[PDB]
Amino acid sequence: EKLIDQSKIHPQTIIEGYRLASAAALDALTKAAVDNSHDKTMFREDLIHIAKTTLSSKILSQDKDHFAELATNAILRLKGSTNLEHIQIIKILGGKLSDSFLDEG
């Protein structure tokens, strides 16, 4: 809206403006991308940090410290196809959320 009302720039050029700017933001993520293939023990902690970010803003953020290792160890026991059908969720009443357990069976 500022690119139209107070600017006078054609909207197709604005679309071309975003296309060149979005490709710059995608190249910025590529240059700043940092991955650890080595030290799978340290990459395990990275998955815990990724879990704490995804569990944030949600009711799971209370016990997230227990849930971060819960979801991380759940993925590590797979080591294979990303299909989520290998993981089942059963909801039980009673007890604190930290009482949830992971059963590989």
């Binding site: 139209i4 009302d5 107070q6 600017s7 006078k8 720039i9 054609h10 909207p11 197709q12 604005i14």
Partner: peptide, 8 residues
Amino acid sequence: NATFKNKE
């Protein structure tokens, strides 16, 4: 198209 609005 979309251009300068010229409120005043």
